[PDB]
Structures are given as C-alpha cells and as structure tokens.
Amino acid sequence: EDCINRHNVYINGITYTPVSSTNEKDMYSFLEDMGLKAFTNSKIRKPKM
Amino acid sequence: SGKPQYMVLVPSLLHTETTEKGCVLLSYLNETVTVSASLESVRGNRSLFTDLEAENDVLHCVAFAVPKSSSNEEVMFLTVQVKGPTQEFKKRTTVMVKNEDSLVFVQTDKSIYKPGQTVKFRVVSMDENFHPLNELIPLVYIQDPKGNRIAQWQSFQLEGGLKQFSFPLSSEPFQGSYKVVVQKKSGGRTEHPFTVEEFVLPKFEVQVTVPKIITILEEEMNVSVCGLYTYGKPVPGHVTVSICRKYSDASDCHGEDSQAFCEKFSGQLNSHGCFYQQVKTKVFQLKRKEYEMKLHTEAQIQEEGTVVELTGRQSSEITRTITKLSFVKVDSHFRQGIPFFGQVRLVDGKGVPIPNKVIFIRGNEANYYSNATTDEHGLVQFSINTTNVMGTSLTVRVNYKDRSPCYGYQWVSEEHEEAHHTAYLVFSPSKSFVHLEPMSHELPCGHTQTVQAHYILNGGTLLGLKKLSFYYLIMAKGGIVRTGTHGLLVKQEDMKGHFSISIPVKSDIAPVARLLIYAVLPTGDVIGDSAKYDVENCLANKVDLSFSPSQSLPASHAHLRVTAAPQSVCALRAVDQSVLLMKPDAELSASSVYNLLPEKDLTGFPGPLNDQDNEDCINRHNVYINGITYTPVSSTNEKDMYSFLEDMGLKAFTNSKIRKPKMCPQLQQYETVRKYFPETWIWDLVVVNSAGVAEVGVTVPDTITEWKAGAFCLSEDAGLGISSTASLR
Amino acid sequence: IYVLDYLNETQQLTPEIKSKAIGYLNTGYQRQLNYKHYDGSYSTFGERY
Ligand SMILES: *[C@@H]1O[C@H](CO)[C@@H](O)[C@H](O)[C@H]1NC(C)=O
Ligand SMILES: *[C@@H]1O[C@H](CO)[C@@H](O)[C@H](O)[C@H]1NC(C)=O
Ligand SMILES: *[C@@H]1O[C@H](CO)[C@@H](O)[C@H](O)[C@H]1NC(C)=O
Ligand SMILES: *[C@@H]1O[C@H](CO)[C@@H](O)[C@H](O)[C@H]1NC(C)=O
C-alpha cells in the first residue's frame, strides 16, 4: 500500500526532511531471509516506490 | 494550548544616523522574555546591545540605530539573546552594516550647449528621507574629456541644501560630453554631463512617418511624409514613399538585384499641413519567408530643385512573431487558499486584439480547462481549481506545447507568441496561509487602500483559541515603515476566506510597497508571504506655477506665480519647451528623483554576507531520526516559508521553522541633434513667502514656441516640491 | 610658466584652470629635465651638441 512520498503533513522541526532510504538489511526482508511471506499490521514501511 | 513563540524579524541592512525600524513578535504567554540583539564580539565593545522589552501579543516596534561603522561595510555575527530567567537561545548572523551617506543630485538647464556662452548649473542635497540637507563637500569639478578638470570650486557650503553656479566656456571645445564630478567625505560620487558643439542651424528638414510593427492581416495603412524647411512651413512639391523587401542578411556575392518585393507610391505635396499617403498591406504580400521590407522615402521639391535625400525608418521591423499575446497580471504567487487570478491579454500591430476572440485556457496538471474570450472592457480574469502537488505550469494558446518540431534545421521556425507560465508552491507544511492578489493597477495618493486578503485554515485550527493573531508588515528597501495588528475570531473547523486589511499611502516608501502578512500559530509554525504593490509618484510639498496668460511678444511685463508650502528655497528655471520637446527630460522629474535614490532594495543575501550557523551546517548529521530518512539542512524551495523572509530582505531568530545557511550542504537539480535657439530665458533663486511669491517674469520676445519652467522647490517645512509640468504658449 | 602668478592675484580669473596648468607643468618641468643639456644649456631636445 504505502509509498515513499506519502504523509503530506508537517515536516521535521529543525530542517526539512525530504524522502530517501538506506541500503541496510531490512525487516520485510527477514521474512524473505526466512524464505517466506506474511501479512501484517506491524510496520514494514520502507522503499516500495 | 500552545508553546512559546518569539520571532524578532531583523533587516540586516543598516543605515547610520537615520531611523531604521526594529520590531519583535511574542505570543502564547509563558515566564519572561527580555530578548537583546548584541553584535557578538570577543568583548562587549562593538555590541549594539539592544535589550528590547518583550511581552506577549504586542507589536511596539522600536527604531534602534547604530553609530558609524569602522569601515564602510563590515560583517559582525549578531545574536538575539532570548533573555529568559532559565532559557537562553543563540543563533548568530552577520550584520550588513553600511556607512550610508546622504544623497545629492545635480540639476542642469541643458546638456547640449553652443560654444561661447555661460553654462550655469545647480547641485542639491538631501538625506535618507526626502528633506533638504545642508552639508559641506570635499570638492566639485567640471571635467573636460582629456582627463583634465575644466571647472573647479573648493569646499563650499550649501545655503539651503543646494547651491547654484555660473561657469564660462571657451568657444573652442572638443565638441562632446563634458562631465561634472562630486566627491563626499566618505567618497560618494555623482555625475551629470553636458555636451557642446558649434552645430550649424540647418534651414532644411524632412520627416517620414510609418508604423513600426504591422501584422499580416491588415486592411490599409497611413504614412505621413513631408519635407519642411524649418518644420513649420508646409511646402509644395512631390514625394514618393518606396518600400522593398530586399533580403534577410543578403550577401550580394550573388550580385542579383537584392530587391525581392517593391511597392511604389507617389503624390504631390500638400501646401497646408504636411502630406499624407495611404498604402495597403495586401499588396506587400508580407509573407513569412519573405524578407526585410525597408521603409524609406524620396522627396523632390518643385520651383527650387535642391533635392536632398533621407533614409528615415530605413531599417524596418522584422515581426518574426505574429499575433503576439503576453501576460498582464499573472499572479506573483499561486496558492490554494483562494482561486488566484492570473491575467493575459493580446497585442497585435496597432495594439487591438480581435473583439471577443475565444481563448484556450488550459492550466495543465490541474486539468481545469475553461475557455474564455477577451472582453472589450475586461481581460481574462480566470482561475483553475488545483488538486495536485507543488509542480504546476499554465499556458494559453495551448493547441500544443511546441508547434510540431519535426525539424527546422535552423532554416526558419514558425514561432507565434504563446504565454506559458510555470509556478511553484508555498512550502506550507501546515497547508494553511493567506493569499493576497496583487494591487497592480492605478493607485492615486493621499488616501487609504484596503487590501483584499483571502485565507484558509486546513483541518480547521487543531486547537487554536478564541482568537488567533494575523499581523501585517511592510518592509521598505531594507527597513520597516509602519505597523499593523488585526485578528479574527477563528471558526474552529470550517473554512472562511474574507480578511480585512488596510494601509495609508502618502510618501516615504520604496518604489515597491513590500507588504507582508503572516499567520502566527500556537504550534510553532507561521505562514505568510510577500505582498508587493506599486508606489505612485506623490510628493510632500505640492506646488503649482501660474503665469500672466499668453499674449504677444513685447509685453516684457509678466508674472511667474508659484504657490507651495509657506517656506522653501526654490529654483526658477523658466525656459523653452522646444529644448524639452526635442528630447524628454528623462533625467529631471519627480519620479526621476525618486528612482535616482540608489540601493533600491537589498533583498535576500548580499555578496558581503558571511555564512552563519551553529549546528545545521554540520554535514551528515546522520543518526537517530524517527522518519524514513534525514535529508538537506536547507529550507530550499522557490517559495519556502523562509524564502519569504529572504524576499523581504530580513532575517529572524525563531523557535518556529525558519533559517537555512548558504555555504553548507545543499542538493541540486531536484550623430547630430536638430536645433533651435538655445538662449536660456530665466535663471534665479528666491524664497517663497506664505501667500505665494509672485515673481514678475520677463518675456523673451522674438521667440515663439512652447515654453516651460524647470522649477524646483526644496524646503525643510514641507520637504521637496516640484511643479513637474505646467504649460506656457 | 607664469600661470603660477595668475591664480590669486587677479580676483577675476578662473584659477581652476591655472591650477590645472600647474598640473600640466608637473610634467613640463620633467620635460625640461629631458630638454636640458649636461653642460647646463637648453634646446628643443637636449644634449649631444
Ligand atoms: C489612412 O488610410 C485609410 C485608408 O485609405 C483612410 O481611411 C484614412 O483616412 C487614412 N488617414 C490618413 C490621415 O491618411
Ligand atoms: C467554453 O466554456 C463554456 C462554459 O462552460 C462552454 O459552455 C462552452 O461550450 C465552451 N466553448 C467551447 C470551446 O466549446
Ligand atoms: C478549489 O477551489 C475550492 C473553492 O471553490 C477550494 O476550497 C479548494 O481548496 C480548491 N482546490 C482544491 C479542490 O483543493
Ligand atoms: C593675492 O593677490 C593680491 C593682489 O590681487 C595680493 O595683494 C595678495 O598678497 C595675494 N595673496 C594673498 C595673500 O591673498
């Protein structure tokens, strides 16, 4: 569902934080590093597109 | 409920020994605020320690000043110390101090002069404001172009903020521009030239009249051409106006007779008035590929035979753009808060768009298409409902974007005018603001003007209160001029779009009225924007001249009645208007002396600005943030919230979201003059009584033309006064 | 040369222009330094006679 541009509400109070990400190993992947999939409400919210 | 909000707006540009306003915002009460701006130095010596009392919900702006700076300009890191009892805030910024000097101008009767007479000139002095200023000067000197001072007077003193003179001249000058020099104690220099030449008075002159620009679709045309020996003696004879498309950049290596088209028209001169001829636009077949139709004439005089020739309007006007429309009042700042009203008209040839031509209004990426048509009295007053991201761009005549660029090969391209505009967003993370349409129309002076401001509050006011404050401020070329406080009982969760706002107009403002208005919120966020308005020329000491009415020559007895403020030292240059009709007075006028004032508005960051920050400039502040990422330190946008303080020219030290630095990491990409008698008529100084001094003017007989008085009243009782134009026949 | 004696003594003259004449004479006396002779005499161009 989610995307990286969403949540057009207030910005960080010190500077503006536009949208970007990290190359590290992620949580949604740990479902795939197990080798499977799942359906969740806990947050896997990270760079889809 | 709220937080503490302090916002002490500051124009960095300073002015020495002259009043510059300084204000402060505070609201949403807490313990104690006694903020103090101190130019941070290793010792408290250069510190302009300005401890301002700061209570909440007030605008009592204080015009703190500074003494002479060490140099002419300088940078000094300045901090407002938020002088709480247990809270202290520090954010440095370099101060654009400037040892601004008082302004002076020079007045001259003419620039051209005949070799042998006495050149006589005046110099004037004022200050930051528009009153006189009596002041000494190091030196003044007229300059001859060989690097030598042709006139020079030493360390005089002004009698009333000005001084007159009378200087001789040799009848053998280098016939050319002679310059006058001044140098103040600090080194401020002013320039006013005058040319000289023993120009022969020709007893022969000729004139051609042809329209400059003419579109393709025209029915007919007029060309007034006439050879008159002194410009006032409509002669008989015969004239022929010939025009020919020869070429666009012909080489004549080909040697072919360059003329492509030619259309010849001949007619006998008219004895009364100066002759008129009718030509039609279809016979030219002024086609696109067809080439430069030079506009020339040929006059032959009967009974005398001395046939002189003239190439007048000889270089024609290639109108590579046909049916050229434009913008009118394309809105300075697009906002969702009201339907903005950009505006567009069309001009063509003579300057008359087709009556009720329907236009193709497509503001795209909002997808609000609503065609309209030019009204005989109204232009297009349109709006597009945007429901989209910051990126927007509009255009009309929008059958395409580019014509059909299969190719041009630089051969020639079919470019008609299409008025496309690209716009950007208020970076308002609150999504709440006030849009102020521009007052870019006529604006008579000596009144008050209620501005029209329409606003929104998205998501209602989240908590707000019974009353939210909306102050409005007018920066003025590096400084504020007036204060304004207004509010409105904010409806909690429904949108309203009528805000009342007004301001008086007299004088004492930059040529642009940089109004600003902002929305002080309890949530540490404030949204506003610039509000530019014209300032029309309206002066302090309004004065009108009057003369004993126009009659015959020998009545040397006359009057030159002037009525101004009760006291003034005034110039009386009653002269000819022939020497103004041959050349308009672009140098001398009311609006002139308005716009000669330099430093029109030092907006944004100046060159001398040295960078400022404490922690934000630290590149790669890269850890521990509860978002997807953490991106530039900048407030970067075209209309970000701090870009509005930037377009003001003022900085701020604010607990809300304002400041960005510059040096620190930012991303990117995402001949001869026709002449008559130069004999000057009147030259003298007087001092007005209360009833209006009525100087008995002298008639200069044997000289009939249009006559003018370049008068100039300067006074500290009513400021400067000018009778900019009043006619004598 | 005698423009020096004409600055103040007249009470009518324009001494700005003779004050510039001495400015020209500040090069004139160097020209004379260049128009001199070693033995002590003077000519249009100087020595070697
Ligand atoms: C200009 O030309 C048009 C067409 O011949 C005519 O209606 C009009 O009277 C002309 N005006 C003058 C001043 O020649
Ligand atoms: C222009 O807009 C009007 C207003 O809705 C509409 O009635 C009309 O059909 C439009 N004209 C065109 C180009 O069809
Ligand atoms: C469109 O205009 C309406 C008023 O007619 C305004 O409320 C709205 O914010 C604008 N754009 C939208 C739909 O967001
Ligand atoms: C200036 O010239 C006058 C004569 O015109 C002379 O008496 C005087 O000594 C000169 N210098 C002074 C002292 O002004």
Swiss-Prot record, chain B:
The chain holds residues 26 to 787 of 1474 of the full protein. Secreted in plasma. Transmembrane segments: none annotated. It comes from Homo sapiens. This is Alpha-2-macroglobulin. Glycans are attached at residues 30, 45, 222, 371, 385. Belongs to the protease inhibitor I39 (alpha-2-macroglobulin) family. Is able to inhibit all four classes of proteinases by a unique 'trapping' mechanism. This protein has a peptide stretch, called the 'bait region' which contains specific cleavage sites for different proteinases. When a proteinase cleaves the bait region, a conformational change is induced in the protein which traps the proteinase. The entrapped enzyme remains active against low molecular weight substrates (activity against high molecular weight substrates is greatly reduced). It is found in: Secreted.
